[PDB]
Amino acid sequence: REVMANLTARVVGAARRGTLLEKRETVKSVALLVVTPDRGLCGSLVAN
Amino acid sequence: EGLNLVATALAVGLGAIGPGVGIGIIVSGAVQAIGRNPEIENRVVTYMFIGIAFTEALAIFGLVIAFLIGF
């Protein structure tokens, strides 16, 4: 967490702000991650 | 005698030694800087050219003597 803070502060130029950290403009496709229990009986947690 | 001919060669000869190395170092540094940061390219080139000419300013000074010595 602090290594990100220490490193990303140094790298501020948009030209070198590529690859994963690149804040792309005109977003078109979005992927999402969901984690759920393997087994039920958890209650409303899975539904939530 | 013909000793002025040695002065003709020495001015252009020894004069080109310094700038010859200097021009090489300037462009090499600029090319590396362009390669690492391509978006500052338009700016570093201006710095390269305003300094790379200072290097041949002495080389032209050698050539000025190189023709003054002849005549």
Swiss-Prot record, chain A:
* Domain of life of the organism encoding this protein: Bacteria
Compartments it resides in:
Cell membrane
The protein's assembly and partners:
F-type ATPases have 2 components, CF(1) - the catalytic core - and CF(0) - the membrane proton channel. CF(1) has five subunits: alpha(3), beta(3), gamma(1), delta(1), epsilon(1). CF(0) has three main subunits: a, b and c.
Q: Which family does it belong to?
A: Belongs to the ATPase gamma chain family.
Q: What does this protein do?
A: Produces ATP from ADP in the presence of a proton gradient across the membrane. The gamma chain is believed to be important in regulating ATPase activity and the flow of protons through the CF(0) complex.
Q: What name does the UniProt record give this protein?
A: ATP synthase gamma chain
Native source species: Chloroflexus aurantiacus (strain ATCC 29366 / DSM 635 / J-10-fl)
* Section of the entire sequence shown: 50 to 97 of 290
Curated annotation (Swiss-Prot), chain B:
- Superkingdom assignment: Bacteria
Q: In the UniProt record, which is one GO cellular component term?
A: proton-transporting two-sector ATPase complex, proton-transporting domain
Where does this polypeptide localize? Cell membrane
* A GO molecular-function descriptor: lipid binding
The subunit structure is: F-type ATPases have 2 components, F(1) - the catalytic core - and F(0) - the membrane proton channel. F(1) has five subunits: alpha(3), beta(3), gamma(1), delta(1), epsilon(1). F(0) has four main subunits: a(1), b(1), b'(1) and c(10-14). The alpha and beta chains form an alternating ring which encloses part of the gamma chain. F(1) is attached to F(0) by a central stalk formed by the gamma and epsilon chains, while a peripheral stalk is formed by the delta, b and b' chains.
Q: What job does the chain carry out?
A: F(1)F(0) ATP synthase produces ATP from ADP in the presence of a proton or sodium gradient. F-type ATPases consist of two structural domains, F(1) containing the extramembraneous catalytic core and F(0) containing the membrane proton channel, linked together by a central stalk and a peripheral stalk. During catalysis, ATP synthesis in the catalytic domain of F(1) is coupled via a rotary mechanism of the central stalk subunits to proton translocation.
**Site residues (Reversibly protonated during proton transport), renumbered to this chain:** 56
Q: What is this protein called?
A: ATP synthase subunit c
- Which residue spans traverse the membrane? 6-26, 49-69
What membrane topology is annotated for this entry?
Multi-pass membrane protein
Q: Which UniProt keywords apply?
A: ATP synthesis, Cell membrane, CF(0), Hydrogen ion transport, Ion transport, Lipid-binding, Membrane, Transmembrane, Transmembrane helix, Transport
Q: Which family does it belong to?
A: Belongs to the ATPase C chain family.
One of its GO biological process terms is: proton motive force-driven ATP synthesis
Looking up Pfam families in the UniProt record yields: ATP-synt_C (PF00137)
Instruction: Specify the species.
Output: Chloroflexus aurantiacus (strain ATCC 29366 / DSM 635 / J-10-fl)
Write down the HAMAP family for this protein, in alphabetical order.
Answer: ATP_synth_c_bact
Q: Per its UniProt record, what Gene3D superfamilies does this chain match?
A: F1F0 ATP synthase subunit C
- SUPFAM superfamilies tied to this protein: F1F0 ATP synthase subunit C
Query: InterPro entries, per this entry?
Result: ATP_synth_csu_bac/chlpt, ATP_synth_F0_csu, ATP_synth_F0_csu_DDCD_BS, ATP_synth_F0_csu_sf, ATPase_proteolipid_c-like_dom, F/V-ATP_Csub_sf
Q: Can the keyword Transport be found in this entry's annotation?
A: yes
